[PDB]
């Protein structure tokens, strides 16, 4: 807070591996425009929109900071160290700092732009630590810290939605004025710091099972229990054993599922019509349909079917050059959840078969497929994996009830997540008239701000204690020659993340 | 316990609002007849009854006290204070007192009844604090303390059911003799007091969400994730944004549902046949069908459909003059759960759509409706609201397993609820014969008793901390003129509750 | 509180004169029926009523005690002692007691009534010490303690009014349940006691002025000030003196007035038409007209006009045998306020004359009468007198503003007056049915109660310090023979108050 | 510029049985939300709000 000629912070970007902990530190340079020309605005969908797409809400003049992706905090090498050596990890605490604030004024003049420092201007910042504002982190929006530390990013604009009926609003709809919160005001000498402790959450499981739920028995020994092995010409009963594993009695059940449509990576194997919407699995809420994407954690495909993926059931990331609209398959990266096929149903199949009738002398036994199956006692399952470029946490909705609140896009469910950090350039009016006018001032000096931001996160690690004799699968770079090195810049300075990297490499018994 | 000419208690009827607590106190005058002419009786259904309606059980000579409705403890104004100002509440402890006991004897004589005090007669009372008797509170029976403190009420008779097979009993059926418990005996000078502490339970949610589960995103910013936006003439992938909210990836799912039939308040929109039973949703247990009423918490109707309600899915109260059998629509009050449509499916619709097949070059993608959906990981929901005239608590059945034991009629699930309080007039034999007869005595003096009863409950309150700028919805009386004042007596002294009042007025973000 | 055979209080009826204080004690026997057959009832005016007479309210089963008249506490001799010897008095504190409670049950049988003691029955009593109920004392209602201590009285029924629009009610109308208050319950052995301290109030003025406001000057000496004594043929100015007192300059003004119509006690001097309503002075409030009775304190008549009285401007009491409706003049007693004619305008005249125009060479000077005149700086006045049979106190309405809140019927204005004391017989149900019926009980044993009540009031006195040489006027009995003695019983035991007795006998200078 | 004001409150102690009149937003749908900004950022106060809702005896 000293003054104009003194830096208010240093560049901290590092990773420190200590025993059962790893501390990441990330610093970036940011730029904040004036949004909405300083105004709050009501926003809503157009009259012609599909009912599924209607909304009502507000856009605000404020921006906000989003570090909610793993590559904000972990270099690719660090991620490798994590996933090859640890069975699990979770966040413990964080520190946040905003510093080296610079406010600039822009003047159009006659033909060219002119930029100068406005030494007396201020930026406002506050953390919503009581969770009093709509929480828009955790929706997988753009605008995070860029993965490559040398890139400079634009702070995204804050807006929110409230109750809508069509394009209109309801009496219970809420409007929030962010100036109705206390906030710190910073001139170029000032800085802002915030610290937070994560609530206890279970370790993410970074491991794959080396056994499947249906093969947990001793293959050498028969069961003492009997099953009905013969109906023809009278009932008969047998003890199951190594030659009939499908018949053995078991203690547990695979996890729940909600079946999705199956898409082929081979173009000629797909229907040529338009099923993009009609093929998706959807939930129906207050008259509106929403795709269930990614939906319950389910394995992407069964053995030797790797060409298939569920229509709305996997996270999909773009390659560096991918278009925003209608990018082709070769321009995207499709995640693969196959490692959980040991406990979880495959996303594109049935849960199983249920009996539908009463068999008798004249009536055959009938079954039908169960394509959607909720929780049953004795079920076990794995949650979806997390990815280097994927999200970290989400806010658990505040409700009477929830079940297993692991956010379905992956990551850590938190009742009290890292708070939203809001920032805004304080408006500076231009010269007012010399006769009093009661109207609110509409004329402002054009400004923007820039600075540095840092976030430090301490992560707890769960070590591997395996007695496995043979070597593990490990994430590795290719050792062969190539034109570029993976996860680097090219000749034009563009950083790119060529592939997605999950966490499940090491193994564990069921 | 002093004697004949000294009152054994005072009239305590009050409400005290202290900070984060509210203490209600309620006193009423009661009258207790002799039930069953002092006998225990086996009771069962008739041979001609429908199998769904068979039962076996016992009626007892005892009566019992029931204060298990909110209007026993809260005046309408008090309820208003509660719901307009608080996000939640729960019970903490209670005190119970029985006092000013009066026992009367009735003599028929020749032409007219004569009533006199029997100063030496006693009444017996005990609280089943070990939960050793069938617990019949929590079935929404009549016989509670009346809502208006000046009304005098009859104590209801205690009876219970046990295992039946048709109209018969099973070896494991239980018979309970209430005289096989210790009980206090009270003459006109004596009184009885009991105190109880509620177990920790979560706050009832008295609030509505100001956001819906499908609109939790920032409307200004696109997602970094991709979805499959085009199948026709090849696959294509897009990032979802403000113009396609139905396609965005999300972390959570709406709550479970079991779909019910839809009834219209407009008479001409209903089928004219008899579907009253065949239209209901039912569960099948040991060969018997029971309606699932009200069933899982589900919103009553979607936007602009307020004329519809689920057939068996809402609490329905009678107006003061409503008949017991076949009252018309205008004589009943139908509750409305619309506020939970933000997180819970509408009761009369599907949960969603699930994929049923494998699409290919020659085969279109198929889906079907899911009309019943159990719990999935990542679901969130609200429980049913409570009402001024609705129930307060229920006993959680003693079982190996249960899930989210919020009683489906609404209110607080308790493993150890407020105990049943049983009361009986001690039999007084008439003059026996002057020669010994071993038969049990069948001739008794006709008696009844009357007294006062008080219950005090301490409730804990959860305050509202909202940053909402615009005013809330609030429960209000109508300000216009009217012939009567709502929630008062009429010119004949009849008290009436004109409308139902829920708890959900204030709002909160998800 | 001992029991059946022990009295719970003694008969205290006395007056003790100590120095500058007088303590009155009054005991009476009361009887309380069941009112409204135990019910609360909405009550309102009929459709055909005049708009001025519409109302809406409730009648309650409760009774209440009213001691708000002076003859409840002062014997006629005591009142004489007070008014002949003291310049003022005010209440200081009181004690109240209810005791020797007896509850009786009445049985109709075949041909004659039978009355018996119900030893276990209770009566309920409470004092509204927080002023939470409509306060109906101070409206000059019947039902007070009788003036003669041997008379036994019926406790009056409590009811109240709330906002009405015509015969209907408004949303802001209030309904009060008196069972929603704590109250003490008394059996025949129990008693109830209450104590209260009056707030500081000014002494009532029991004295008449021996000077008039317009004669306060020294009759022997001229003024140094001049007045305009001559306009004809030029202005001229004179100093006023003993021969022109009407012209002297003065410091003060007579009190306010609102002129009323003049009625003659001589029948032939009155108009023979119907002016009973059209002749009254009235205020207009929310479309309703109310007579202004008695209205502002004004002298009843001027000197030698004692046959006249203001139409609605004096308290009027009935003689013992007076009818309730259309009693003739000889059957009523009309109070006379003539003693305040020294400072207050006469009720049937104008306040004075005000100038209405601008006089000049061609225009004469004009004045007009002022028949209604509000307060002006420099005004002085006396409040209305109090009477042996008149009211004592009134509750000052709770409002933003008031001016000189001496209640216009006379007596002491109190922000926190003696609280209402409410009493009710607890209902005792008759024998209920032997099968449970949820309807409220409609069948009760017929009962009433009786007991004694005592009130003790301490009064502070202001002594007379006059230097007057000649004897005072004094209130006196007539010394001559008569058939009856004033303020006694007649040969049939009827007590009667033959005349009204004010307080203003002794004199004081202005 | 900032201004902070401390206000003292007088609580309600009524024994009224029936519910009070209360100031409330309308619960129905509408194009705009009362006491908010519109699509152009203009804040507006649609109606006046007095203080007299709760009741008291004279």
Residue numbers in the entry:
A (entry chain c), B (entry chain A), C (entry chain S): 217 to 726
D (entry chain x): 669 to 726
Q: What sentences appear in the manuscript?
A:
The cap open reading frame encodes three viral proteins (VP), VP1, VP2, and VP3, that form the capsid shell. The AAV capsid is comprised of a total of 60 VP monomers. All AAV capsids exhibit T = 1 icosahedral symmetry, but only the shared C-terminal VP3 region has been resolved, while the extended N-termini of VP1 and VP2 are intrinsically disordered.
For AAVpo.1 and AAVpo.6 capsid structures were generated from 512,823 and 539,729 particles, resulting in final maps with resolutions of 1.79 and 1.77 Å, respectively. On the other hand, AAVpo.6 is more similar to AAV9, with 98% aligned residues; however, significant differences such as in VR-IV, where AAVpo.6 has a 7-amino-acid deletion, resulted in an overall Cα-RMSD of >1 Å. The two porcine AAVs show little similarity in the surface loop structure and are as different to each other as AAV5 is to other AAVs that have been isolated from human tissues. The AAVpo.6 demonstrated an even larger preference for galactose binding, roughly 3-fold higher in Lec-2 as opposed to Pro-5 cells. AAVpo.6 shares four of these residues except for N470, which is substituted to serine (S460), whereas only N272 and Y446 are conserved in AAVpo. In contrast, AAVpo.6 shares many amino acids around the 2-fold depression. The equivalent residues in the AAVpo.6 capsid are K481, D552, and N696, explaining why the 2-fold antibodies did not recognize the capsid. AAVpo.6 crosses the BBB in pigs, a trait of significant interest for gene therapy.
